[PDB]
């Protein structure tokens, strides 16, 4: 088995999976009582997205060590995968039970349960995570997301400021940063952070949308109108952008330009 498994392993490390999968199967068909070659064929499995033989596979090594972290940790990673969150969170917490100094445990059980809607526990497992480990903007920025989700704005602003401070060229950053100012109702603040995720990433619709609304509610109505339009070119079937273009020159008189865009959002639906 040793020679077969040693020839997996060689396969596994050039990226080879498949290979590594027959010669893993051909040892373990030999020796089945290798804890680490069930969990060397599991982790071959996962790397091809094959979740449900990765799944069996690491339960087999978990069979002969209940007390291996690194199994339990990739069973939850490939229910992760198959989009069982509550697998993945039971597998996490078993995984941390034995192996409390990982930050990836942590940080991977507060996706699980961000991903089911519970961002209270993750709040708890991202803060954990960047207490081990707090050198990942994207971390910061899930922390951020968290707090978003649960409605903590001025807790979002801080983090999303934490994950810019590492990573100042992410546009999804500097977009939920506006989110989160405009949702405070700061709507100076969310244009400056709308500009500049607009000025990396100039072509998402919601994005000029969303400017649109911040002119708006300071009342811009004039700079309210040029971001609309700009909503409509990329997306002409918004019936949001063309009623409140519609709404923005209503504000200033322009009564006939009112009629025509609302017009075209009663088109595009016809229900409010
Ligand atoms: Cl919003
Ligand atoms: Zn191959
Ligand atoms: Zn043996
Ligand atoms: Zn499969
Ligand atoms: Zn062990
Ligand atoms: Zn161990
Ligand atoms: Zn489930
Ligand atoms: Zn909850
Ligand atoms: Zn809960
Ligand atoms: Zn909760
Ligand atoms: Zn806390
Ligand atoms: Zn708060
Ligand atoms: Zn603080
Ligand atoms: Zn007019």
Not at 44 to 65: M, S, T
Not at 235 to 256: H, I, T, V
């Amino acid at each position: 088995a040793e020679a077969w498994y040693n020839l997996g392993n060689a396969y596994y490390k050039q990226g080879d999976y498949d290979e590594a999968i027959e010669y893993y199967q051909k040892a373990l068909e030999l020796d089945p009582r290798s804890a680490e070659a069930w969990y060397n064929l599991g982790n071959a499995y996962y790397k091809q997205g094959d979740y449900d033989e990765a799944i069996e596979y690491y339960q087999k090594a978990l069979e002969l060590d209940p007390r291996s972290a690194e199994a339990w940790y990739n069973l939850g990673n490939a229910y992760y995968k198959q989009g069982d969150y509550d697998e993945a969170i039971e597998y996490y917490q078993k995984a941390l039970e034995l192996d409390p100094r990982s930050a990836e445990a942590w940080y991977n059980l507060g996706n699980a349960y961000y991903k089911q809607g519970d961002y209270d526990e993750a709040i708890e497992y991202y803060q954990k995570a960047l207490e081990l480990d707090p050198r990942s903007a994207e971390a910061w920025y899930n922390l951020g997301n968290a707090y978003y989700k649960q409605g903590d704005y001025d807790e979002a602003i801080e983090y999303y400021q934490k994950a810019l401070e590492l990573d100042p060229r992410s546009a999804e950053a500097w977009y939920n940063l506006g989110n989160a100012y405009y949702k405070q109702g700061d709507y100076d603040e969310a244009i400056e952070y709308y500009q500049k995720a607009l000025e990396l990433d100039p072509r998402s619709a919601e994005a000029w949308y969303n400017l649109g609304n911040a002119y708006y509610k300071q009342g811009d109505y004039d700079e309210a109108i040029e971001y609309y339009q700009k909503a409509l070119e990329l997306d002409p079937r918004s019936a949001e952008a063309w009623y409140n273009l519609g709404n923005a020159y209503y504000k200033q008189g322009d009564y006939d330009e009112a009629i025509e865009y609302y017009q075209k959002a009663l088109e595009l639906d016809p229900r409010s």
